[PDB]
Amino acid sequence: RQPYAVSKKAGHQTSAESWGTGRAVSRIPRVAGGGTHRAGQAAFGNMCRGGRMFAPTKIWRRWHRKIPVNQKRYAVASAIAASAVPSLVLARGHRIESVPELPLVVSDSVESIEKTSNAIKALKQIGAYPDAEKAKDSHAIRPGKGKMRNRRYISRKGPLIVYGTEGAKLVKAFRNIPGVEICHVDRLNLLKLAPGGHLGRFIVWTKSAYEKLDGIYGSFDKASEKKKGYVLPRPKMANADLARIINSDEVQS
Amino acid sequence: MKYNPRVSSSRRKSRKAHFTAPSSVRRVLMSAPLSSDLRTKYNVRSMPVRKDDEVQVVRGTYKGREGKVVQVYRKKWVIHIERITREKVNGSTVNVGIHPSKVVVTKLRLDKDRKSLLDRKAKGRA
RNA sequence: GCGACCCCAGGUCAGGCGGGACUACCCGCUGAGUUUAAGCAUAUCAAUAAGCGGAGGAAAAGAAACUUACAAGGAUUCCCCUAGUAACGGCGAGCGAACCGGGAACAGCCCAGCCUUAGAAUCGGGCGGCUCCGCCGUUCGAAUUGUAGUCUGGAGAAGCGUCCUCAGCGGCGGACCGGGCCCAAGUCCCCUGGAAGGGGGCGCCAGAGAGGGUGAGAGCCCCGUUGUGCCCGGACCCUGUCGCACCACGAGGCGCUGUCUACGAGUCGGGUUGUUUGGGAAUGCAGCCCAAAUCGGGCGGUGAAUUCCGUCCAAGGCUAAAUACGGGCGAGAGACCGAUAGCGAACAAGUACCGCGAGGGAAAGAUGAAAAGGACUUUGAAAAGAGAGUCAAAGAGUGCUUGAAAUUGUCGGGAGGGAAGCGGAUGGGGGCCGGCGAUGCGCCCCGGUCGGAUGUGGAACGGUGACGAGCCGGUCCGCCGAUCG
RNA sequence: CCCGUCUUGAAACACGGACCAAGGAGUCUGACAUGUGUGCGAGUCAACGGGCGAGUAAACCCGUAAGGCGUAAGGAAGCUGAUUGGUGGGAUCCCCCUGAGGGGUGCACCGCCGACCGACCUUGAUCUUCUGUGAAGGGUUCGAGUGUGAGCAUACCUGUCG
RNA sequence: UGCAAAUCGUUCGUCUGACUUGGGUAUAGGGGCGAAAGACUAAUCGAACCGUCUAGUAGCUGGUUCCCUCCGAAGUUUCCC
RNA sequence: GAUGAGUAGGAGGGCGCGGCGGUCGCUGCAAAACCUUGGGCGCGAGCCUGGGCGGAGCGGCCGUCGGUGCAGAUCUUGGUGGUAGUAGCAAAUAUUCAAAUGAGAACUUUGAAGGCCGAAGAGGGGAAAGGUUCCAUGUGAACGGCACUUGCACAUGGGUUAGUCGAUCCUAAGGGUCGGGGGAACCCCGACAGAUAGCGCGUUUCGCGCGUACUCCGAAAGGGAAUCGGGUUAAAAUUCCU
RNA sequence: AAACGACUCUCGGCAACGGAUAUCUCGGCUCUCGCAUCGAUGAAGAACGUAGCGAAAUGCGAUACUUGGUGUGAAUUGCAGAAUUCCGUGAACCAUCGAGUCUUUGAACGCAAGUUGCGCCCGAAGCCAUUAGGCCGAGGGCACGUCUGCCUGGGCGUCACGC
Numbered sequence A: 001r002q003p004y005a006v007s008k009k010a011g012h013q014t015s016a017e018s019w020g021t022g023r024a025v026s027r028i029p030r031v032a033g034g035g036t037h038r039a040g041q042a043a044f045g046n047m048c049r050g051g052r053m054f055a056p057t058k059i060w061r062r063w064h065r066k067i068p069v070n071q072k073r074y075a076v077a078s079a080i081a082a083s084a085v086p087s088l089v090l091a092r093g094h095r096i097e098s099v100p101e102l103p104l105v106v107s108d109s110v111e112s113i114e115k116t117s118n119a120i121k122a123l124k125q126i127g128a129y130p131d132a133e134k135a136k137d138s139h140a141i142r143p144g145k146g147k148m149r150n151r152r153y154i155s156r157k158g159p160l161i162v163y164g165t166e167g168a169k170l171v172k173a174f175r176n177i178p179g180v181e182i183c184h185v186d187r188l189n190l191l192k193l194a195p196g197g198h199l200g201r202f203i204v205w206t207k208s209a210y211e212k213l214d215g216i217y218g219s220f221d222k223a224s225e226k227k228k229g230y231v232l233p234r235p236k237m238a239n240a241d242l243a244r245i246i247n248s249d250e251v252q253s
Numbered sequence B: 001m002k003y004n005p006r007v008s009s010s011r012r013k014s015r016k017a018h019f020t021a022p023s024s025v026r027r028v029l030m031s032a033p034l035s036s037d038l039r040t041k042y043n044v045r046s047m048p049v050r051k052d053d054e055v056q057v058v059r060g061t062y063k064g065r066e067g068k069v070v071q072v073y074r075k076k077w078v079i080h081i082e083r084i085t086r087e088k089v090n091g092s093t094v095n096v097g098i099h100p101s102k103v104v105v106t107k108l109r110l111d112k113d114r115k116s117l118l119d120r121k122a123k124g125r126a
Numbered sequence C: 001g002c003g004a005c006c007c008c009a010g011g012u013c014a015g016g017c018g019g020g021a022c023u024a025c026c027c028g029c030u031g032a033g034u035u036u037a038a039g040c041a042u043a044u045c046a047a048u049a050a051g052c053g054g055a056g057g058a059a060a061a062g063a064a065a066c067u068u069a070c071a072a073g074g075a076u077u078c079c080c081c082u083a084g085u086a087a088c089g090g091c092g093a094g095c096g097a098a099c100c101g102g103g104a105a106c107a108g109c110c111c112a113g114c115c116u117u118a119g120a121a122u123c124g125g126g127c128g129g130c131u132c133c134g135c136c137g138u139u140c141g142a143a144u145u146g147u148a149g150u151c152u153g154g155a156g157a158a159g160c161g162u163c164c165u166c167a168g169c170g171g172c173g174g175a176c177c178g179g180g181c182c183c184a185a186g187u188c189c190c191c192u193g194g195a196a197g198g199g200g201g202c203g204c205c206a207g208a209g210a211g212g213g214u215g216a217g218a219g220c221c222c223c224g225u226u227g228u229g230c231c232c233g234g235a236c237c238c239u240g241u242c243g244c245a246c247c248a249c250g251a252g253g254c255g256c257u258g259u260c261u262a263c264g265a266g267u268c269g270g271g272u273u274g275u276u277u278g279g280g281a282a283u284g285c286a287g288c289c290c291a292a293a294u295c296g297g298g299c300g301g302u303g304a305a306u307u308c309c310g311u312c313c314a315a316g317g318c319u320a321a322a323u324a325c326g327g328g329c330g331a332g333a334g335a336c337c338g339a340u341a342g343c344g345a346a347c348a349a350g351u352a353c354c355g356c357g358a359g360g361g362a363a364a365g366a367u368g369a370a371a372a373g374g375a376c377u378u379u380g381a382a383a384a385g386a387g388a389g390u391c392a393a394a395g396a397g398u399g400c401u402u403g404a405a406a407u408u409g410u411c412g413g414g415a416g417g418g419a420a421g422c423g424g425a426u427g428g429g430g431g432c433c434g435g436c437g438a439u440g441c442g443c444c445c446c447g448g449u450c451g452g453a454u455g456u457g458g459a460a461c462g463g464u465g466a467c468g469a470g471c472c473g474g475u476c477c478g479c480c481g482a483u484c485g
Numbered sequence D: 001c002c003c004g005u006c007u008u009g010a011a012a013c014a015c016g017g018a019c020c021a022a023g024g025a026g027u028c029u030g031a032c033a034u035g036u037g038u039g040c041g042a043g044u045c046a047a048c049g050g051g052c053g054a055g056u057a058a059a060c061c062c063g064u065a066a067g068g069c070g071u072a073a074g075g076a077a078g079c080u081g082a083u084u085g086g087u088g089g090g091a092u093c094c095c096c097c098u099g100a101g102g103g104g105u106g107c108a109c110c111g112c113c114g115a116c117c118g119a120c121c122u123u124g125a126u127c128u129u130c131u132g133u134g135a136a137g138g139g140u141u142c143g144a145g146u147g148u149g150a151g152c153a154u155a156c157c158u159g160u161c162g
Numbered sequence E: 001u002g003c004a005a006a007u008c009g010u011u012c013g014u015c016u017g018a019c020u021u022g023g024g025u026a027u028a029g030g031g032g033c034g035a036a037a038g039a040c041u042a043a044u045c046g047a048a049c050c051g052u053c054u055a056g057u058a059g060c061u062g063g064u065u066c067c068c069u070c071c072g073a074a075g076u077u078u079c080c081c
Numbered sequence F: 001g002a003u004g005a006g007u008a009g010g011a012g013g014g015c016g017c018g019g020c021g022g023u024c025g026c027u028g029c030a031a032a033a034c035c036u037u038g039g040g041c042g043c044g045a046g047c048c049u050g051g052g053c054g055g056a057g058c059g060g061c062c063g064u065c066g067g068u069g070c071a072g073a074u075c076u077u078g079g080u081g082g083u084a085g086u087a088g089c090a091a092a093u094a095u096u097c098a099a100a101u102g103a104g105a106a107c108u109u110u111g112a113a114g115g116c117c118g119a120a121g122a123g124g125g126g127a128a129a130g131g132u133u134c135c136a137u138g139u140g141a142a143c144g145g146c147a148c149u150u151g152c153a154c155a156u157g158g159g160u161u162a163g164u165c166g167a168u169c170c171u172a173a174g175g176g177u178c179g180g181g182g183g184a185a186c187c188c189c190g191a192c193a194g195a196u197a198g199c200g201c202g203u204u205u206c207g208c209g210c211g212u213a214c215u216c217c218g219a220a221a222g223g224g225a226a227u228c229g230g231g232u233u234a235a236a237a238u239u240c241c242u
Numbered sequence G: 001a002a003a004c005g006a007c008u009c010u011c012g013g014c015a016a017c018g019g020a021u022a023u024c025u026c027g028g029c030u031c032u033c034g035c036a037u038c039g040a041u042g043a044a045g046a047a048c049g050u051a052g053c054g055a056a057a058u059g060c061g062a063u064a065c066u067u068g069g070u071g072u073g074a075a076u077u078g079c080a081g082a083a084u085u086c087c088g089u090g091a092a093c094c095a096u097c098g099a100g101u102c103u104u105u106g107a108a109c110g111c112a113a114g115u116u117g118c119g120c121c122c123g124a125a126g127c128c129a130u131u132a133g134g135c136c137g138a139g140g141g142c143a144c145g146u147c148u149g150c151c152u153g154g155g156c157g158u159c160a161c162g163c
């Protein structure tokens, strides 16, 4: 975010003074002088026209937040795990009915694509093109005052392509397609993995990025190479299949 | 996506620049596309509208009309054509302003500068 | 009387310098009270506001008369921490640093004094030349009451060795900055529209789907955006290379020495007074009094004496970077406001207007796509009215998108013996409502269409199992019978 | 009986209110505290800064003997610095029998009493650099201590304070 | 709620002097000036006017904006200029 | 199964407004907003919908954020009522008749009559102050507290002529200053701490002789060089003409 | 006979009053970034003028909504008129800057100021005037404090040489 605040001097650029009691009027301070429509009018009041607002906004409001790195990594791991569930990906609004399999891992040759037409052909081949088409078709003008605040157009989110090779040309090839986002496997962002805080982003992995995932996030047993001393969290339930536990021989006996 | 740091995507700034553009900038802003034949001949897509250019309207109520341009009202962001007019309540005839982006150039008034500009435009396209 | 010097005077003498303006940051001075302490005087507000001056692009500070007491750090500045800590405080209210440690950036230097005396080797002006931000020649003047050169404590002078180091020009590029020019794709078919930029169909570009304009939500109509290519000009600084002469007298570096080794005064320091500081027998500053020293002087956070120890060298000067920045010029953005909001000011706003004056200080945005801004007839003195015309629209007619409430006129319904309104229950009248309120279902006969096994083949596939075997199974298609639904 | 308000008491001869539109008042920030959610855990906290990176105010990564808080307290200070428990109730579980039963188990928490560390007092064999040490033995004294850790970061409501 | 933020009508004091009056000039805020009423100092005077500190502080007065549901008081103790 | 009061106060669950991250939609075959004795849902905050108007955008849902909800505050700004066609129009003696113009005449112009100001004027000029209000022509609207044909209003043009009238010159109370003395400085005192400005004579422009520290501002009434008749313009005159 | 009408009140349609609501925005507010450039060579500010038709705003300075160079390349426009070899030394209420103009003031500088008031000096051209001077005047000079150099001077202040 960027800070906002009203001018600190607004509503106070006057020498207005209260008339006091005895004039059958309120005690609010009033502009001095005469010969103008402004003379005698109230000032300095949050209830006064042209006055100072109650508790004027200030720039030193606490705009930012300092979340623990471990919690950030927990959230990122959760989003990545959810991206592999077809049910959650569908529930998040992505059209994945034509995707061959999830997680969607494609050959590393896609990283060398240079033209947007070739990128579109690759999307069609891998079956992720319907989602991009939905994102393009959802293009529309933002309702409300936001359209005049330099945020004019809104649309749905398409696939997120994760690549593992620095400097790949697929970033240039794909960046112009509406809804399509691109990221490097070493700097994954929760804001893109769970848009709007909702789990199940449709993700297309390159083979190199998918392979690097193990070295980046480690595992339960051993530690990560890219995250010093980090270990993936464990759930409170080893097996979340409640029916299997409830209808087991031991309990039902 | 814009990347140059000295260009702004602000709607307010873009509108202010467009509406306060001087005459020289307005000339470029008031460009029109060339007809198919001229496009093929000159390898050029669009040109600034000139006074003595032949123009065919392609949008609006005068979609089929054509004629020579007779005035380029830059202050009003319009051009006037020979016989594209209308009658007032008085009965007198007045030209109807047409935006250059809504017309097509069928014949250009060629001079040394016009030919040089055409050559410059064609060179980049190759 | 003349001459030399000294001090001073007059010059519209020849040539230079200064004053004032701006405010966000910066430097110096001066300096409150409101307020808090539930009163109030010390305190706090505050080393702040107001007042008076002085600079720059930054300023200021800056190369230890430092920090420390350690196994020691090493100009200045800034950030984090130290730390709401040591300390200060009617020890009340409150106030409150510094060192270490981790980072940003880093850079060191110039003078005065003893030291030419085989000659002031220095500098300014005029004049004349030159490859002219300067150099050379000549002549006057400054200066011995001292200009040059060496030296600055880290050293250094002098002497002896080492043979280690030191001398420019010009061309072409790179780097930095500021500009100029060109360069993708539909305006194809149908419909609604005043106008497609809206819906449907068919195509295309994309390292360009940031943004804006154009008659309604426009990637492909226009300007632009992305990425190349080419062209022009500054900065003479940094950097690579190339062409030529490359001279060590001299000066530096290194080693040695039974020789020297010059260092800032009404200044330091002390007493006292006032102020300030966390600085507490007194932190800094300033007035007055006293007033130093050179085997010495300052500091070592409790005053004093004695003996040691540690650390630096003031009273002269310069210096980029890290840092600050509501002013000026130029840019980019926003979970900000949307005409009683947002700057006072979206407009000929610090304007109109008010005050003798210092000063005070408003209200006020929206026709239409396009003026196409309403010809003409008629009534009227006229403003205008009634017709008529433009437009998609006048139910858009220039204070012209839309047009709430208070309040008012007209028509229609209704009520009314010194309030009205209101809660509850019915009724009269009005208004409204057809998901307001159904017409199907079962069993038979006739006629019309569509399909009919547990049989046999094909296509793909599933449940379970072990995304094996085996078992089981549904959908669709082709045939022999069956003659049913 | 006219609302709003102060009030023991309002319809009041108590104050505001002629009417309508729009504006109009527990907010932001700092220090704490309880509670709750989340991560990790004797640790926790990379956002002072650095490396980068949506060609990028985001996101990602980085703690060398850095630092803060916690991990030890008691004394004004010099200074010294936790010998590691018992017992009565008590949840859960396991056995015998089916009584308001008996045995074993005995977390959390509470009650009671010891022990250890330190301030103070008292005490004193042996060593010892002669002022230190500490075999034994203590106390109606004192502590925001110990007796197998519970914190750190972050979010929000509420409360005190500038 | 005036012709008027001091006026109008009748009446009244003095009227060659300590007389009345124009212009110029001097004295400015804890200051001036005052044959003295705390008078006057631009309708402002027992301390003028203008901007700022300043959103000065108030144990005191007035307001303090949606619904339903549950729970539900106190005017008593001690200390306090 | 039991049960239901609530001021101050606490808490829970919900309704509503505007953004942001997501998601699902609506809209020129008509969005928002507004209007309506249309209809319905909810205890309620509110919500859904018919019809109209409007003519370009808007909504639902999940999180999250805030300058987020009004009947009051002698609250703020703006707008509007009853009062009410009411209070009022009354000081300065006063108007009348005929005609002209004009759509319109108690209010304009001409003539006649009857009155007032009564020379310390309701007459004729100036100073300050104002600034075009001066003169001619014309006039929709506003204004001239009734009215207007009208005008100190509005619009278009015109108009201020100096050797003699003033300023200008002199100095008054006083003001502003050099130097000097104070002052952090803005500034203070003001010829008081001092080599004054310069003035006359003849000239090879040099000499001679005098020379008491302001040769500055300060009066359209103080002092002071000089103009008179006659005539002339719509508006100027001791200024224009003779 | 309390009926029709008037009045008051009330509900509805329409018409008024007023400018709320909704949708907008060449404006504001906030954050971030780059650069370092006023003035006696007369600044900022202040006044007066200037266009064919302008009062204000904007611009400009008697060369006065602009001169000149360069770039672009056919307008400006409310009206009227005039250009332009419009295949070009060339339109533009265009852009940009190197040349040039730049009225009265203002730190403001000859003295003043409620004054376009009051002084002194130099001097191009011209008139006739002739190794002589006169009239006129374009135009420009005359503040203060200081630095360097210079010219002209004063004082037994310190000396020396002569009388």
Ligand SMILES: [K+]
Binding pocket: none
């Ligand atoms: K020389």
Ligand SMILES: [K+]
Binding pocket: none
């Ligand atoms: K020297």
Ligand SMILES: [K+]
Binding pocket: C152, C263
């Ligand atoms: K020395």
Ligand SMILES: [K+]
Binding pocket: none
């Ligand atoms: K020294």
Ligand SMILES: [K+]
Binding pocket: none
């Ligand atoms: K002293």
Ligand SMILES: [K+]
Binding pocket: none
């Ligand atoms: K020492």
Ligand SMILES: [K+]
Binding pocket: A050, C344
């Ligand atoms: K305003």
Ligand SMILES: [K+]
Binding pocket: C396, C401
């Ligand atoms: K309309």
Ligand SMILES: [K+]
Binding pocket: D005, D006
């Ligand atoms: K009350």
Ligand SMILES: [K+]
Binding pocket: none
């Ligand atoms: K009342």
Ligand SMILES: [K+]
Binding pocket: none
């Ligand atoms: K730590």
Ligand SMILES: [K+]
Binding pocket: D075, D076, D119
């Ligand atoms: K003790």
Ligand SMILES: [K+]
Binding pocket: E029, E030, E047
């Ligand atoms: K006073």
Ligand SMILES: [K+]
Binding pocket: E059
């Ligand atoms: K009280």
Ligand SMILES: [K+]
Binding pocket: none
């Ligand atoms: K939405």
Ligand SMILES: [K+]
Binding pocket: none
């Ligand atoms: K409705």
